[PDB]
Amino acid sequence: QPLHALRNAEKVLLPGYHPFEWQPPLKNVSSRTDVGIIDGLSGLASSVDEYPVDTIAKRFRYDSALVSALMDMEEDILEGMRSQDLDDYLNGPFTVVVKESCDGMGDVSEKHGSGPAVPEKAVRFSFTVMRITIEHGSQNVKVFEEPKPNSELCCKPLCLMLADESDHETLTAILSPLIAEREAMKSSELTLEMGGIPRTFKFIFRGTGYDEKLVREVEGLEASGSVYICTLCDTTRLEASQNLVFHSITRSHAENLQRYEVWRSNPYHESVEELRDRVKGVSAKPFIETVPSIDALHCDIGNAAEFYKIFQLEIGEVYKHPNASKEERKRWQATLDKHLRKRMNLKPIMRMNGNFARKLMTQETVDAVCELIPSEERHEALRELMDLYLKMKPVWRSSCPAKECPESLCQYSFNSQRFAELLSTKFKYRYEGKITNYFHKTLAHVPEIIERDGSIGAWASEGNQSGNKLFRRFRKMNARQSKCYEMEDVLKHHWLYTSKYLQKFMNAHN
Amino acid sequence: FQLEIGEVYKHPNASKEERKRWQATLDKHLRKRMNLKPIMRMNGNFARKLMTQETVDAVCELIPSEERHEALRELMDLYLKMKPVWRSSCPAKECPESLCQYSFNSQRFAELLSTKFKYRYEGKITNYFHKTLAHVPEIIERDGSIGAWASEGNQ
Amino acid sequence: KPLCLMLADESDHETLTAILSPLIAEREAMKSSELTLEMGGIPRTFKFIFRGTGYDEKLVREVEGLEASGSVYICTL
DNA sequence: CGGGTTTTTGTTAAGGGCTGTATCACTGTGTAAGACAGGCCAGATC
DNA sequence: GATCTGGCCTGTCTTA
DNA sequence: CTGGATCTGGCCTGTCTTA
DNA sequence: CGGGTTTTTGTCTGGCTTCACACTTGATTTGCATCACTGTGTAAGACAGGCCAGATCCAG
DNA sequence: CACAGTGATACAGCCCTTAACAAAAACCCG
DNA sequence: CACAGTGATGCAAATCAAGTGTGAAGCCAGACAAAAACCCG
Ligand SMILES: [Ca+2]
Ligand SMILES: [Zn+2]
């Protein structure tokens, strides 16, 4: 068909097409059901008499986006209903849970022409459904669940703006309407027509696709180099390097709000350090509610980087020679890089990534590294260390540790305790009084995380990075090259690409 | 342009912060008037858009002098009169007047640089200014067209 | 139309010459011959006159045997 | 070669609807080292 | 034993 | 009244942590 | 809770199409598994420690 | 005078429906 | 336990070709059953 036929058919898939209405009318939200791509600034004034604005933004409306996604998944929901031995005319309360994500991007070049002074950065925000469950009879039964939770074909974009993730003012000014809509939606039901039957929908919002940097910046916490290292418990860097296995999740949103209140009001009238101790390192007002979780991608990246460091320290026998110049460490790093290129076919890189991390964690990699170390017992130490790490990783890296690795799940505490003991005894030269964030996050909190959710790898931020790649591609080859319309085009094209109603036409092999 | 904004013909000495300020002011002006973002290395489209009469008009709003204005106007006029000779795919059938008057225009351009631009072009010159003012008519009469043999296709 | 792809430094003279020697050899060889072939069922005759002009000034200085641009002999013509 | 009769086209008195093309403001490929002239301290020196 | 020389640096200019 | 021992203030400077 | 009055259809009835259906074997054409890799992860902030400077204190 | 794109918008072009006529291409008869 | 690619290669499976006689699923002339969905009775 010609291009105008495509343009006309696009209307059915884009948001703002199907009528819907919540039981108890959303607060501070309009009732217009024909609201599609709108301005992202949300009526922010651009007068010279006020704070300067230098960003642009485009976004949907959140409820309209969810209604469009449900219209898109209607067929999958009906097939799930049929496959579980249920009736299609059931209109019970559907329980939906989604996954949120947000990351900043760099090296986004600015274009010529008129317009505001747009910075050379970008920040994206997206959502992704996870599962749908109806309450039939007494217990529950799941109707649909994403088979590929970390795929780029299921990361629906919501908001796109060319700003800086460190600019707190602009970030809040852009994200506050979405958070308001989310909070208003968290206490309402959605009446929606599927196959000619009004269905009831309820939502459970969970945000886990955030790196630690953004969590610390949003949850009203300090930076990563602070003494409070964990975003789940209240331990400090000192105590975290002495116990390593006995901690409990404590941090939460309401607790952070109360903490900030205590910090601002200062009821007991104490000094700055005593007030920091009382508040446990909270000095800002949170504005996004997130659940305590762990990102698997960045966890693996940090673990591989630290292992890398440990390897290039073991090559130099630092456990006996505490003093060392910079040239010695440079020679050690260069020797390790050349040996990895020779035996592992790996190219030495500067910034740690995922594939390098996946290829580095292997027993034969440890053998190739031990080929560089004269000592004997350090070989055994490194081999046992890597064995423990590789026996622990599938617990949090898999999508269902209760069925894909029950042996490693039920024996996760003993492995973590032995790992901590090995760090304290043999590697004392580096982990005496200090330790990284991920190490604590992995050794202390993840069993509670599985017992609280059931999986960690499914709730990662992989799909977010795949969406960043798709964004880089679309902004360059699937959009008008102009500041006034590039973002709307990219957003619409990505929304069309992420849809499932079109992907079924490509699976015409069964 | 940068040197003319700062009046080098009036103050032969200058610090580095003065240079930085001059460049920033020129970049800011060009961004606000000609709609051109600041770039690190000279581009090709930026070069095409930068070489206009309007650009000189916008730049002259920063030079307080009045003769400098005339100097830059005639400079840009001569350069725009010499451009199509080496940029056209067939100057013998697309711009015969510019081809026949290229020598006179080049001589006037050189005289202008030698008289009113001594502060920069005294006892030194680049490569392409020499190539353009000295060797273009002979290459034209020898091959017939410059620009058709450019290295743009490889780029 | 492409003719050669390599992964080498432009400033690296030894590798550049070692890779480009056969091409220049074949070029200089056939610059004194004529080609015949049958297109449309009729044999034809062809003669070539090659002109290397798509070179920036740095590569011209490199291949022609001159020095960097910062010298005093500035013009290559 | 003509009257008489037939077939297969033109045709604007005005609107509906699908299809093709011009328009607008921009984009990506030109992207690392060498030549040189002036200034300044260690140093052989008459 | 201060006196020019030698050589070493270094910022600028030129092409990318 | 004053020279001089000398005890912190902060300052800049790496190092480690997330990206 | 079932009587009138057209729709909606499978046949009865046997006799005319246009496709359907056994075998080869040597190609010829599709369909699908396999293998070594790819991108998206990409700038600042917290904290300890040596160092003088200058204030803090001592005694003739 | 680099040039192949890049997506939405608008307008011209070319098709389609009531009109009876009216001009172009051909046999039966004379 | 990322994943959808990125191209070539190599092997397994479907098919076609020519050969030809029969075999079988339609449609069709009316027709007067057999429900069967409207009306309400
Ligand atoms: Ca990022
Ligand atoms: Zn913790």
Side-chain angles (χ1 to χ4, degrees), chain A residues 108-155:
Chain A
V108 177
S109 66
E110 185 179 1
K111 294 181 176 66
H112 295 284
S114 66
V118 175
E120 278 201 23
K121 292 182 184 293
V123 177
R124 295 180 65 251
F125 183 77
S126 296
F127 83 76
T128 297
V129 298
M130 294 299 291
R131 107 200 19 154
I132 298 169
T133 299
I134 187 169
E135 183 177 1
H136 188 193
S138 178
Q139 65 183 357
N140 291 318
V141 59
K142 63 179 73 175
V143 176
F144 154 102
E145 65 182 1
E146 182 66 27
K148 300 292 181 68
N150 290 318
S151 178
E152 357 123 24
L153 296 175
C154 65
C155 183

Side-chain angles (χ1 to χ4, degrees), chain B residues 37-55:
Chain B
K37 67 181 181 180
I39 60 172
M40 295 299 291
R41 184 178 181 271
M42 182 58 70
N43 210 169
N45 290 318
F46 182 77
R48 291 180 180 90
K49 258 209 232 150
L50 183 63
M51 302 306 295
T52 59
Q53 294 296 111
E54 19 232 28
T55 300

Side-chain angles (χ1 to χ4, degrees), chain A residues 68-86:
Chain A
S68 178
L70 293 175
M71 288 291 172
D72 186 73
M73 227 182 345
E74 181 179 1
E75 294 293 328
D76 291 331
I77 295 169
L78 293 175
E79 184 178 1
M81 217 171 242
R82 291 189 296 272
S83 179
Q84 296 293 321
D85 292 330
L86 276 73

Side-chain angles (χ1 to χ4, degrees), chain A residues 5-24:
Chain A
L6 295 176
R7 239 160 254 142
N8 193 1
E10 289 179 354
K11 275 34 146 341
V12 177
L13 295 174
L14 294 175
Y17 181 76
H18 294 88
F20 62 66
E21 98 149 76
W22 314 73
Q23 210 10 112

